[PDB]
Design a binder for this molecule. Sequence first.
Ligand SMILES: CC(C)CCC[C@@H](C)[C@H]1CC[C@H]2[C@@H]3CC=C4C[C@@H](OC(=O)CCC(=O)O)CC[C@]4(C)[C@H]3CC[C@]12C
Length: 177
Amino acid sequence: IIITFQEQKNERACIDFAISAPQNRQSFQYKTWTFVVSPPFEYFIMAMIALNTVVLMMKFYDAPYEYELMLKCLNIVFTSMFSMECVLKIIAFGVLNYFRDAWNVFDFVTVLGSITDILVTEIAETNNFINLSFLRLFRAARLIKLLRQGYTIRILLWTFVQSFKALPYVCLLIAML
Ligand SMILES: CC(C)CCC[C@@H](C)[C@H]1CC[C@H]2[C@@H]3CC=C4C[C@@H](OC(=O)CCC(=O)O)CC[C@]4(C)[C@H]3CC[C@]12C
């Protein structure tokens, strides 16, 4: 099936078709922009991503309850820092400049999810709905930010996923089966 697969030169055509294909310095805006574009800031964010994943891993069953309290405090600290990072981005860049990156939207959504999770877990039992705990996905989903830094693996995933997006009817045939 691999050897004989119909196509329904090309490199040059794709290259020739793809051939078609920052913020200013005024005030404290520029100071915040300089801080958030400083490579130390981005590296610090990466490091705290790593530490947050470590804290997410540190959970285990039947903890002394001085361990769970420490984990909750660390989660509060991490989500507070991430909200602060989102605030400094939304100030240093424009609001339109921020919500038009397709990654800053994701970071903002995960920050709001984490904050809502923190707020709910304190009085969660009073909701009495099966969807009380689904807000805990955002802490885990914060892990994705390293997939950006993993260059070849991000390229590989994006290529294969956009390939899957161009075949919506084979999946419909399997669903029909
Ligand atoms: C690439 C690595 C360096 C990054 C991740 C490091 C840690 C976040 C991971 C490494 C292995 C994990 C540990 C694997 C097994 C232990 C012991 C385990 O202790 C028990 O189960 C005792 C309970 C009982 O015996 O009844 C609790 C989780 C814990 C601390 C885990 C805590 C988090 C750890 C240290």
